């Protein structure tokens, strides 16, 4: 399809996204043989795949949730493995162990090594802003039915 996508279980990262950055990210790791988009930041959709497993929080399966997505090694922090990491906008759910699909709709920015967490946070806020606008255009492009996605303006 026109959206690059990957699927796989949400697994444990460094534990810093929510606690330290205020941007929790659902982490996926793939073998180096698996085709991925270029390291960078993307606007896209995260969907919990069809399942009978209970989901705790305000996300349910088979709905495309607006997400700001990073691909790479988190060079600001010097992490060892390449991850795909999805910050689901305006939601709060326990995704660990759930099988999810992540669709990459638009490239937003190159992956960058920032000197400080504070500088990184300022830029991530702007990535989220651009993600909202890009995803509203994508809704229109596919004439997506309201029940099939979740996308808000921020409070
Ligand atoms: C939209 C978005 C943009 C990001 N941009 C960068 C970046 O430019 N440089 C970087 O080192 N990490 C970037 N990250 C990743 C954060 O470093 C990472 O998600 C955070 O350290 C949490 O790590 P963890 O999930 O293992 O706890 C970005 C993450 C998101 C969600
Ligand atoms: N809006 C959200 N987007 C992504 N993950 C969320 C969100 N709200 C809660 N979570 C949960 O928080 C975890 C991500 O937080 P994070 O600090 O990045 O932990 P980790 O380092 O283990 O990836 C997810 O795996 C999921 O269970
Ligand atoms: Mg994370
Ligand atoms: Zn599209």
């Amino acid at each position: 399809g026109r959206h690059f996508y990957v699927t796989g279980p949400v697994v444990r990262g460094a534990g810093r996204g929510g606690k330290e950055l205020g941007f929790p990210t659902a982490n996926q790791y793939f073998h180096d043989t698996v085709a991925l988009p270029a390291d960078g930041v993307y606007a896209g959709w995260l969907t919990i795949l069809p399942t009978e497993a209970p989901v705790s929080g305000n996300m349910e399966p088979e709905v495309a949730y607006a997400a700001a997505i990073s691909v790479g090694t988190n060079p600001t922090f010097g992490d060892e493995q390449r991850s795909v990491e999805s910050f689901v906008l305006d939601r709060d759910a326990d995704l660990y162990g759930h099988d999810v699909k992540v669709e990459f709709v638009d490239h937003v920015r190159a992956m960058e090594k920032f000197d400080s967490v504070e500088q990184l946070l300022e830029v991530m806020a702007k990535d989220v802003q651009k993600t909202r606008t890009l995803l509203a255009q994508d809704v229109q492009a596919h004439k997506m039915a309201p029940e099939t996605y979740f996308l808000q303006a921020e409070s």
Side-chain angles (χ1 to χ4, degrees):
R2 279 190 190 275
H3 306 164
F4 201 108
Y5 74 90
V6 294
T7 67
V10 173
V11 298
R12 294 283 162 166
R16 80 172 76 87
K19 196 211 89 164
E20 280 177 34
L21 311 208
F23 289 97
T25 51
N27 294 34
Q28 294 165 307
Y29 298 83
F30 299 90
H31 286 113
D32 63 351
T33 56
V34 170
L36 295 176
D39 286 354
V41 186
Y42 297 87
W45 302 107
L46 180 150
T47 303
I48 298 157
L49 290 159
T51 186
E52 237 72 72
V55 179
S56 174
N58 60 13
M59 295 170 64
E60 66 187 270
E62 307 188 47
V63 175
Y65 291 94
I69 303 153
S70 169
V71 181
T73 63
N74 304 337
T76 301
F77 299 97
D79 290 341
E80 283 145 316
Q81 290 165 15
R82 172 165 290 101
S83 59
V84 176
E85 290 188 35
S86 296
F87 166 60
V88 181
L89 275 41
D90 320 301
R91 294 284 81 181
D92 183 4
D94 177 3
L95 301 173
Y96 284 114
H98 285 285
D99 201 4
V100 305
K101 169 165 128 204
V102 173
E103 288 171 70
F104 300 86
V105 177
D106 296 290
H107 179 272
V108 172
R109 185 170 60 76
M111 188 52 46
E112 172 148 345
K113 180 175 188 181
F114 291 94
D115 292 347
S116 72
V117 180
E118 287 82 6
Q119 288 156 333
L120 168 63
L121 297 181
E122 285 186 23
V123 177
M124 291 171 70
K126 300 180 174 206
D127 296 331
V128 173
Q129 288 167 345
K130 292 179 192 215
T131 292
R132 292 178 193 280
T133 301
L134 290 163
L135 296 177
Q137 297 167 331
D138 200 54
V139 169
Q140 294 309 302
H142 311 293
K143 299 180 188 178
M144 302 181 191
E147 74 278 1
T148 73
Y149 72 94
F150 176 98
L151 165 64
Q152 199 182 289
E154 74 147 22
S155 319

